[PDB]
């Protein structure tokens, strides 16, 4: 794919976007978990931004029959719109969800 | 050392009748109190809740010796007010080391410096403060009922004599009479309280009473109801002597009536010694098990006095127009804060009490010093206001009305700003020291469940801030009714100063006007050091608050 | 901040405030020696607060160690 | 030393130089006024240096200094994207605030310059401190200089105006102190890094909320508690009016991003309908009574109450857009309210000695430069597009609608009512007939001083309106940290 | 709980407070500057003592009456009694605004004192380890998800994993309509 | 005219390759981890002091 | 302060502006002023607040398409 930029190594998270198994009194590990979650939520919203830019070019390209040519892009944008918001880490940091 | 100083000063004062020698007896009193500081400074080399001395009738604690040092320093600062002339003459030609130490100035200093003012003519004034100080440092160190009573009277009787020492003042004689008469009724309550302790316990020792109280605190023919009843009457006497509401009506009248030099000492030292003694008594009379003994705690009277002192001190002060009546009521609302931290007996509250007491004794000293200096500065000023010609004892209290400070910003800006910084500290405005004191007493009460009292304190702090701001509005928001004396600068009115070298040879002769007269350095430097402490406290707080954290850790330790 | 510097400037600030109260001229040459003197007194009071702080640190450290032995000895005796 | 401490020392150094220059010359007041102005420009150059180096996507506080020595109270300075623009606003206003009031003071000029140079340090500190007790310390250290600024250089009803600001701000801020002391007791420190980790019990949060909101409601201010501002701003000197509206009214706005959004989230969520009910009411009542105000400078002060309510509902939206719009509307209010105060308090009052709208009419005929700028600042007060005020209101209003729709629907009525009073004031002073007959002699138009501070303030309002990304790119990542909530498929990742 | 005889307690409140006011009336007689005699306590200062009994009796009687109706003992009753006590203080002055105003001030303070806890006496002692209690509060950084959803609830941006399936069940029960969003793609 | 000139000069180029000034500006404000290392030390100490303040203030009488 | 230009200050408008400034010193509690005060300060905020509570979290529009309901609750 597109090469990973030099600016995209300095700010790339080194930790998974989670708080499970993170000692809070280790401030270094804690702030990086905060950063990891915020960066993921933001990649998700810019993923929808880019799909929306493609939708627009399919709209101005297909004109009248965009209703039968731009449906795949419409799916992806509507999926992302329901799932990506920047909600922060504060709720995530302060609650644990067992997933069981 | 205080007792060696009293007897030595007494013998010298006994064989003299010269009133010009008063200046030097006050200077030797400062030097004598400095040796007491150096002796008590060496008595801090141990960690002990207390050691009983002289047959168990006295005790020494780190807190006792720390506050013996504090009392001696506060006394030294007040003693300067009678050890140095109020005003000086200064010229740039006599300002170097060679001049101040090897040369000399000659001029008619009598009317400029007020050499024969009333304060500079009482020979036994330095002596009687020493007697008051002695009773103060004994109260702090008393381990017996009898020693308490004898020490409190030693302090009280000398305060009465201080208030009556200006014998030609019909205001000072009245105030001392009021003080002795209402103070004697207070002494009966203290004596009734100790008497009722001994008759029900057979003991005069505080430690035996502490152990009797200790054993009674377990969650039959002899239920110890007497200790909390006896200490309650015993608290009324000391509540009066610190002027906690409702036993407060005397202080505004007495502090207004006696001379301002005197009220500096009278309104500060008594509260320092009484509040220290109460703290140790509150600690060892505590209940560790909530039983029926705890329901009648004597400490409730201090909680009701604090509530009443907060309200009365701030509400009654609103309509005061006399400055010494205002400062009397301001002290009442400040002891409501001191009394609230004493009543909550917690590690945090005890640290807050030690800070509130020391910082307020220092700050209320600056307020008195600024007032005395402002009155000594109107020597080169004239007024035609009609409300000032009708005043009484204008030499004993030169500044009696808040109207007299109108436009002082124009007359002296930094003296005005020093009084501003002091007053805003009484309000509790950050970054000033008085804020951090009230902060610690609000956080202690809140953490222990005294939320209702804390809300009442911050409401009265707004009410009390009203009359503090009214003094500021007078000094800065209006032009001065005081105008420079026209004669002191007529362009023909000059006083000749002569400069003389070591062997009395005229180096120089200078022509000086009223513009070459200034405030004496002892009063300008003292004001400068305390105003800076109030302002720069947030950069110099570690060792002051660390001392209190350590003192309380020893008291609560084990 | 540095205590020696704060106290040295504290003495400098006290001299400045003194002359402002007395309304005297700041910076007269034949009286400039007061600034080193006031600041020098300020520096000295600071070496003393440094000795005070050094000893307070030792004793507050000990106390925190004592409250931890008490809480532990008590905890050990509650294990029975 | 750090670069955030240089921000504080420079205004202190300027105070020293004003105090000592007379000791080297009887010196002119013009020399005192150049010292104070050069000192404020240097603080603005440092602050632009800080902004060049600032990392727009960093979760660690920047330009900090390793203290390594702990006391009971210690100054800890740091900068995050949430605070950088508040610092910049303080450093752009203070130079103009001095220039605006350059001729109008006349007496006690050293004292006036020293108070402003002291205010700049105290207001800079309140954004730079990394503790909540230190925040309170400076959020309330500004009350003694402001009591004396109004009393020494204020208008006729100055004594009552200065008593109102001090006592209301003292009373309101003492309920904040009780809440701060409780959090410190439970956690052991008020340093932000340690406090933000900690999660309070709901009941503690609901009582910490009651006490931070009481403080902020007095200092916003809300409708039934706004009497101090109607007195303070009007009777204040022109320069004090510029500081109090642009910078002091923003201290409560920036204090929600520290004292409420990160540490009391459940309380903020379950109580937002109380906030929005108050915010809606203060949008309507303030606006109805701004229509009938007959003092021009008090018509600018009342307008501020309506705008603060839009940004208060924006900070309580739990939305990224309403939170950034709240900061944008506070920055926008800082420029526009400054200009309208300069027009009312510094041009009309300078030439007439009156603030009554009865006496002004047709001022465009003899003062065409004043009417051009006055129109642009009235349009921004009305939230017209192409000004930063529109962007902040739109984002503040959208997050209000997304949080609780009904209240944002009432709050949206600010579009009709802010427009109503802004044009009505304009048509009555600039337009409304021919030049009044109460003017005996002709009035000069804008001076090169009056023109260039009005032009500077308008320039910031319009350029930032066109490209708000100058401020938006800095807040994004840091705003992301104060949102409370999860999404069912984006959270708890494995 | 154990019912309280409101009338019996009401007399106790009137006598205790009215006794103190009778002592206040007595100071007025002692301090009077004219030869008013001993019977001036019940003629010239009688109103002072009478309103003390009226205020004290109404407070305790209404506090007790409030407790019986609500069948509970808490800080709320100190509010009802304070409102009726302050109302009685306002009746003496005969001014409508103050009848309500004095009731407001009295009710708020007498309830605020009780809900905070009795400060004027010895505060209640939990009798526990303070260090353990304070430290638990500082290190209780994360909580069960169920704990928070109990105080705030799901919704308002709090969409916990599984929110959509639950919302479908919630919406079906209340609206009687099954949620089935449309595709948006003509293909698949 | 100046804005058009300044904007033209300060552009990066066809594909990456920043200019010398761009290299200088990014170099001075590097701070690769020195904000993190200083914040972590300070957070660790102020967290210790909170434990200490609780130990000294909640001690057995 | 600075001298201003000459204004024909109307004694009638000057005393009117003085009247507006000191007006509060004469507010009384009547049956009318209480009725207006109670309506504005209690009733309207309580009505706005009540609707704010009842409709809080009631609706969400994001990504809602046909077949879905706007109502959250
Ligand atoms: C928290 C605490 C932190 C503390 C940090 C440091 C604070 C700042 C430093 C303060 C230094 C003050 C003392 C130095 C001083 O006054 O110098 C100015 C003073 C001359 O400057 P000036 O004010 O222009 O003099 C005007 C005339 O002299 C005419 O002056 P005058 O006749 O009005 O009185 C002259 C002199 C009268 O007193 C003396 O002669 C001083 C005697 C001190 C030793 C005994 O007054 C004073 O010195 C007052 C000092 C008050 C100190 C206590 C304040 C509390 O110096 C002297 O000539 C005094 C003697 C020289 C110093 C010897 C002792 C040094 C150590 C003193 C320790 C106490
Ligand atoms: C705003 C407040 C204004 C207050 C004005 C006074 C400013 C100082 C405030 C009090 C600070 C504490 C003073 C304690 C006494 C001074 C002790 C000291 O500084 O050095 C100790 C020394 C003690 O030294 P020493 O001679 O006893 O033994 C020295 C021991 N070694 C060798 C280890 C150092 O100073 C003294 O001699 C004590 C006598 C002081 C004389 C009176 C001082 C009054 C002040
Ligand atoms: C007399 C006073 C008039 C005052 C108002 C003036 C309004 C127009 C101002 C001039 C506009 C261009 C000059 C802008 C200066 C800043 C330069 C800049 O940022 O880029 C401007 C851009 C030229 O960039 P360019 O050289 O074409 O880059 C690609 C080359 N391969 O060129 C452009 O982007 C052109 C598009 C500008 C906006 C056109 C209108 C869109 C919004 C309506
Ligand atoms: C702002 C004003 C200036 C700062 C004010 C405070 C400065 C002085 C604080 C002194 C108190 C704390 O500092 C310390 O406390 C303990 C308390 O017993 C005492 O310490 C003393 O006993 C211990 C124990 O045997 C000895 O180890 C020590 O050598 C001895 O001096 C001294 O007093 C002081 O060494
Ligand atoms: C905590 C307390 C509150 C702090 C609030 C901030 C207050 C700041 C006040 C500034 C300092 C005082 O400001 C001071 O004003 C006086 C006015 O008499 C000036 O003093 C001079 O003023 C003018 C100058 O031509 C002269 O005519 C006058 O005779 C002379 O006294 C000082 O040169 C100035 O420094
Ligand atoms: C939430 C409730 C409110 C919270 C707290 C707010 C309280 C504010 C109360 C301030 C009361 C006004 O404070 C008081 O105002 C009067 C003006 O009428 C001032 O009085 C002053 O102004 C008058 C105006 O004619 C002049 O004669 C003169 O300058 C002086 O007497 C007092 O110096 C001030 O103390
Ligand atoms: C409309 C405004 C209404 C409120 C205005 C005044 C409130 C200002 C902030 C008050 C903060 C709440 O009060 C604070 O709550 C916490 C717990 O929740 C208390 O913490 C606790 O301390 C003690 C000691 O363990 C406990 O026995 C007790 O359960 C509780 O009081 C604090 O002691 C108290 O200070
Ligand atoms: C206007 C004035 C309103 C009243 C003043 C504010 C009262 C705040 O006081 C409040 O009281 C309740 C009663 O337990 C306590 O609140 C909390 O206390 C402890 C927490 O430590 C919990 O066990 C308790 O469940 C909880 O209610 C706190 O002490 C405080 O949050
Ligand atoms: C942009 C700002 C404003 C946005 C927020 C306001 C949105 C308003 C949405 C109103 C509709 C909400 O969702 C609507 O609720 C109504 C009930 O009230 C229900 O309406 C339903 O009524 C009957 C039962 O009476 C059903 O048989 C029918 O299928 C449907 O019409 C549906 O659940 C839905 O049509």
XYZ file of N, CA and C in Angstrom, chain B residues 59-204:
438
model
N 5.776 22.000 82.886
C 6.116 21.009 81.832
C 6.799 21.725 80.676
N 7.566 21.007 79.874
C 8.194 21.564 78.646
C 7.771 20.622 77.535
N 7.426 21.163 76.374
C 7.021 20.375 75.188
C 7.705 21.091 74.040
N 7.828 20.454 72.891
C 8.397 21.117 71.701
C 7.475 22.295 71.388
N 6.168 22.105 71.493
C 5.168 23.177 71.265
C 5.319 24.309 72.295
N 5.559 23.986 73.562
C 5.791 24.995 74.631
C 7.027 25.861 74.327
N 8.118 25.269 73.871
C 9.356 26.047 73.649
C 9.255 26.741 72.310
N 8.588 26.127 71.348
C 8.403 26.848 70.094
C 7.621 28.133 70.330
N 6.572 28.071 71.144
C 5.715 29.224 71.375
C 6.208 30.137 72.491
N 7.247 29.723 73.214
C 7.918 30.667 74.145
C 8.748 31.582 73.237
N 9.386 31.014 72.198
C 10.206 31.805 71.230
C 9.305 32.792 70.495
N 8.137 32.330 70.054
C 7.224 33.197 69.318
C 6.753 34.366 70.174
N 6.446 34.113 71.447
C 5.991 35.177 72.336
C 7.092 36.206 72.546
N 8.329 35.749 72.733
C 9.435 36.677 72.933
C 9.682 37.529 71.693
N 9.542 36.977 70.500
C 9.760 37.752 69.244
C 8.622 38.760 69.048
N 7.391 38.352 69.297
C 6.290 39.297 69.142
C 6.447 40.446 70.123
N 6.945 40.148 71.319
C 7.181 41.189 72.305
C 8.310 42.115 71.877
N 9.341 41.571 71.227
C 10.468 42.388 70.784
C 10.023 43.390 69.727
N 9.194 42.945 68.793
C 8.644 43.827 67.738
C 7.792 44.942 68.340
N 6.956 44.642 69.332
C 6.136 45.656 69.986
C 7.001 46.605 70.807
N 8.061 46.086 71.432
C 8.925 46.904 72.328
C 9.625 48.011 71.545
N 9.827 47.812 70.246
C 10.513 48.802 69.384
C 9.708 50.101 69.402
N 8.380 49.998 69.448
C 7.481 51.178 69.457
C 7.825 52.158 70.580
N 8.542 51.720 71.612
C 8.962 52.626 72.712
C 10.489 52.671 72.832
N 11.225 51.964 71.974
C 12.712 51.924 72.019
C 13.332 52.913 71.025
N 12.544 53.461 70.109
C 13.087 54.348 69.056
C 12.120 55.505 68.852
N 12.652 56.679 68.550
C 11.811 57.870 68.306
C 11.008 57.667 67.028
N 9.731 58.115 66.961
C 8.884 57.887 65.788
C 9.390 58.405 64.433
N 10.044 59.570 64.406
C 10.495 60.198 63.148
C 11.983 60.502 63.246
N 12.647 60.602 62.100
C 14.099 60.872 62.072
C 14.349 61.957 61.032
N 15.564 62.494 60.993
C 15.932 63.453 59.919
C 17.018 62.746 59.112
N 16.874 62.690 57.792
C 17.860 61.978 56.938
C 18.296 62.881 55.789
N 19.601 62.950 55.524
C 20.115 63.730 54.361
C 21.073 62.830 53.581
N 21.112 62.903 52.233
C 22.054 62.101 51.433
C 23.531 62.315 51.801
N 23.876 63.469 52.375
C 25.258 63.763 52.831
C 25.664 63.013 54.112
N 24.719 62.457 54.879
C 25.048 61.686 56.099
C 24.341 60.346 55.922
N 24.862 59.497 55.045
C 24.141 58.241 54.732
C 25.097 57.062 54.534
N 26.405 57.269 54.675
C 27.368 56.208 54.422
C 27.790 55.543 55.729
N 28.614 54.497 55.617
C 29.156 53.863 56.816
C 30.018 54.834 57.605
N 30.915 55.513 56.932
C 31.792 56.503 57.602
C 30.943 57.533 58.352
N 29.780 57.919 57.800
C 28.960 58.957 58.452
C 28.224 58.336 59.630
N 27.477 57.266 59.406
C 26.605 56.653 60.450
C 27.432 56.142 61.626
N 28.693 55.785 61.412
C 29.433 55.162 62.533
C 30.520 56.080 63.067
N 31.097 56.925 62.219
C 32.266 57.719 62.679
C 31.927 59.199 62.814
N 31.046 59.717 61.958
C 30.628 61.104 62.043
C 29.438 61.222 62.987
N 28.951 62.456 63.144
C 27.765 62.713 64.011
C 26.956 63.894 63.455
N 25.651 63.923 63.706
C 24.776 65.048 63.263
C 24.323 65.846 64.487
N 24.333 67.175 64.400
C 23.827 68.033 65.497
C 22.647 68.862 64.990
N 21.527 68.854 65.702
C 20.358 69.703 65.359
C 19.376 69.651 66.517
N 18.406 70.552 66.531
C 17.370 70.586 67.586
C 16.399 69.437 67.311
N 16.589 68.291 67.960
C 15.766 67.097 67.638
C 14.473 67.043 68.452
N 14.273 67.900 69.457
C 13.132 67.749 70.400
C 11.744 67.773 69.750
N 11.440 68.746 68.904
C 10.049 68.834 68.393
C 9.916 67.945 67.168
N 11.043 67.659 66.520
C 10.985 66.818 65.330
C 10.733 65.362 65.701
N 11.418 64.855 66.727
C 11.326 63.441 67.076
C 10.302 63.167 68.164
N 9.697 64.198 68.765
C 8.761 64.049 69.921
C 9.513 63.348 71.053
N 10.608 63.944 71.529
C 11.469 63.322 72.559
C 10.688 63.137 73.847
N 9.862 64.118 74.200
C 9.147 64.083 75.490
C 7.671 63.743 75.281
N 7.370 62.828 74.363
C 5.991 62.335 74.180
C 5.594 61.423 75.324
N 4.299 61.190 75.524
C 3.850 60.423 76.714
C 4.469 59.023 76.723
N 4.536 58.361 75.564
C 5.059 56.979 75.467
C 6.534 56.935 75.854
N 7.255 58.027 75.655
C 8.702 58.063 75.947
C 8.980 58.551 77.373
N 8.028 58.414 78.294
C 8.218 58.999 79.650
C 7.668 58.072 80.730
N 7.301 56.836 80.386
C 6.882 55.872 81.450
C 8.058 54.931 81.706
N 8.718 55.072 82.849
C 9.940 54.278 83.170
C 9.592 52.804 83.350
N 8.436 52.504 83.936
C 8.101 51.096 84.275
C 7.293 50.427 83.163
N 7.127 51.087 82.025
C 6.408 50.457 80.891
C 7.164 49.235 80.349
N 8.496 49.265 80.109
C 9.202 48.067 79.653
C 9.138 46.969 80.722
N 9.056 47.348 81.992
C 9.034 46.421 83.115
C 7.724 45.649 83.171
N 6.605 46.337 82.944
C 5.297 45.716 83.116
C 4.972 44.786 81.955
N 5.464 45.083 80.749
C 5.338 44.123 79.657
C 6.045 42.826 80.004
N 7.241 42.927 80.585
C 7.974 41.753 81.042
C 7.173 40.941 82.053
N 6.419 41.611 82.924
C 5.565 40.889 83.860
C 4.437 40.167 83.136
N 3.852 40.802 82.119
C 2.814 40.142 81.336
C 3.396 38.963 80.575
N 4.559 39.160 79.952
C 5.200 38.090 79.195
C 5.479 36.900 80.098
N 5.894 37.165 81.336
C 6.199 36.088 82.270
C 4.971 35.229 82.549
N 3.825 35.862 82.793
C 2.612 35.102 83.016
C 2.147 34.360 81.780
N 2.462 34.891 80.596
C 2.126 34.207 79.355
C 2.931 32.927 79.197
N 4.249 33.003 79.395
C 5.085 31.824 79.206
C 4.947 30.844 80.355
N 4.337 31.251 81.468
C 4.012 30.279 82.504
C 2.736 29.523 82.172
N 1.691 30.201 81.689
C 0.436 29.528 81.280
C 0.764 28.384 80.330
N 1.587 28.632 79.318
C 1.949 27.613 78.296
C 2.582 26.413 79.004
N 3.371 26.637 80.041
C 4.122 25.544 80.706
C 3.488 25.008 82.010
N 2.204 25.241 82.268
C 1.558 24.834 83.556
C 1.033 23.393 83.502
N 1.355 22.581 84.508
C 0.952 21.149 84.543
C 0.034 20.936 85.758
N -0.297 22.001 86.482
C -1.098 21.881 87.727
C -2.230 22.916 87.739
N -3.320 22.639 88.467
C -4.465 23.576 88.516
C -3.967 24.848 89.173
N -3.217 24.721 90.264
C -2.805 25.920 90.982
C -1.926 26.790 90.098
N -0.999 26.160 89.385
C -0.059 26.926 88.536
C -0.839 27.633 87.428
N -1.890 27.011 86.890
C -2.734 27.665 85.896
C -3.324 28.940 86.468
N -3.934 28.840 87.648
C -4.606 29.990 88.231
C -3.624 31.110 88.531
N -2.472 30.770 89.103
C -1.490 31.785 89.453
C -0.897 32.432 88.209
N -0.723 31.660 87.136
C -0.168 32.214 85.907
C -1.171 33.106 85.192
N -2.436 32.697 85.157
C -3.450 33.477 84.395
C -3.606 34.839 85.057
N -3.638 34.876 86.385
C -3.717 36.152 87.139
C -2.458 36.996 86.926
N -1.274 36.392 86.953
C -0.039 37.151 86.647
C -0.182 37.851 85.290
N -0.755 37.173 84.288
C -0.919 37.824 82.995
C -2.036 38.856 83.031
N -3.192 38.488 83.559
C -4.378 39.386 83.614
C -4.098 40.679 84.376
N -3.504 40.594 85.558
C -3.250 41.772 86.420
C -2.296 42.755 85.750
N -1.388 42.258 84.928
C -0.419 43.143 84.268
C -1.066 43.798 83.075
N -1.985 43.112 82.405
C -2.767 43.709 81.332
C -3.663 44.827 81.850
N -4.215 44.672 83.058
C -5.011 45.744 83.652
C -4.158 46.974 83.912
N -2.935 46.768 84.393
C -2.046 47.877 84.707
C -1.548 48.574 83.453
N -1.370 47.827 82.365
C -1.014 48.432 81.090
C -2.114 49.353 80.598
N -3.363 48.935 80.761
C -4.486 49.716 80.278
C -4.688 50.991 81.078
N -4.184 51.048 82.305
C -4.367 52.191 83.182
C -3.110 53.047 83.296
N -2.030 52.649 82.616
C -0.700 53.316 82.777
C -0.688 54.767 82.284
N -1.517 55.123 81.306
C -1.602 56.555 80.928
C -2.574 57.130 81.946
N -2.040 57.621 83.066
C -2.896 58.067 84.198
C -3.582 59.397 83.903
N -3.068 60.179 82.957
C -3.666 61.518 82.728
C -4.779 61.380 81.694
N -4.942 60.179 81.133
C -6.017 59.918 80.146
C -7.277 59.432 80.857
N -8.395 60.132 80.667
C -9.685 59.745 81.273
C -10.293 58.633 80.428
N -9.674 58.310 79.299
C -10.152 57.186 78.466
C -9.415 55.936 78.910
N -8.141 56.060 79.264
C -7.351 54.860 79.622
C -7.769 54.364 81.005
N -8.043 55.282 81.926
C -8.430 54.910 83.313
C -9.776 54.185 83.275
N -10.688 54.640 82.420
C -12.017 54.002 82.257
C -11.831 52.602 81.691
N -11.026 52.472 80.639
C -10.820 51.179 79.974
C -10.211 50.173 80.916
N -9.221 50.588 81.695
C -8.600 49.687 82.670
C -9.584 49.319 83.749
N -10.437 50.263 84.117
C -11.441 49.957 85.129
C -12.447 48.946 84.600
N -12.944 49.170 83.381
C -13.819 48.204 82.726
C -13.137 46.846 82.643
N -11.873 46.814 82.216
C -11.108 45.550 82.023
C -10.908 44.798 83.345
N -10.478 45.480 84.395
C -10.266 44.832 85.710
C -11.565 44.272 86.248
N -12.664 44.967 86.020
C -13.934 44.580 86.658
C -14.548 43.436 85.885
N -14.515 43.502 84.565
C -15.060 42.364 83.842
C -14.089 41.200 83.781
N -12.818 41.476 84.010
C -11.753 40.465 84.010
C -11.739 39.703 85.306
N -12.055 40.378 86.402
C -12.176 39.713 87.712
C -13.333 38.746 87.781
N -14.441 39.099 87.161
C -15.562 38.150 87.133
C -15.164 36.946 86.281
N -14.348 37.166 85.257
C -13.841 36.040 84.486
C -12.932 35.153 85.327
N -12.140 35.757 86.213
C -11.220 34.990 87.041
C -11.954 34.096 88.030
N -13.121 34.528 88.506
C -13.933 33.684 89.373
C -14.360 32.406 88.664
N -14.729 32.506 87.386
C -15.115 31.316 86.634
C -13.944 30.360 86.455
N -12.745 30.887 86.224
C -11.575 30.023 86.116
C -11.262 29.389 87.461
N -11.437 30.143 88.545
C -11.165 29.606 89.870
C -12.248 28.639 90.321
N -13.508 28.915 89.994
C -14.567 27.950 90.267
C -14.322 26.646 89.526
N -13.871 26.735 88.274
C -13.661 25.533 87.490
C -12.590 24.630 88.064
N -11.460 25.207 88.471
C -10.387 24.402 89.045
C -10.766 23.879 90.422
N -11.472 24.686 91.211
C -11.919 24.235 92.523
C -12.834 23.024 92.410
N -13.775 23.054 91.470
C -14.679 21.928 91.289
C -13.972 20.705 90.733
N -12.818 20.886 90.098
C -12.039 19.740 89.654
C -11.385 19.035 90.830
N -10.789 19.801 91.742
C -10.036 19.213 92.842
C -10.953 18.525 93.849
N -12.156 19.051 94.051
C -13.105 18.514 95.065
C -13.697 17.178 94.619
N -13.679 16.894 93.322
C -14.306 15.660 92.803
C -13.252 14.639 92.430
N -11.988 15.029 92.427
C -10.897 14.146 91.968
C -9.818 13.974 93.030
N -9.696 14.885 93.980
C -8.610 14.854 94.976
C -7.260 15.238 94.419
N -7.193 15.691 93.176
C -5.895 15.941 92.523
C -5.835 17.353 91.974
N -4.634 17.900 91.837
C -4.450 19.239 91.238
C -3.655 19.055 89.945
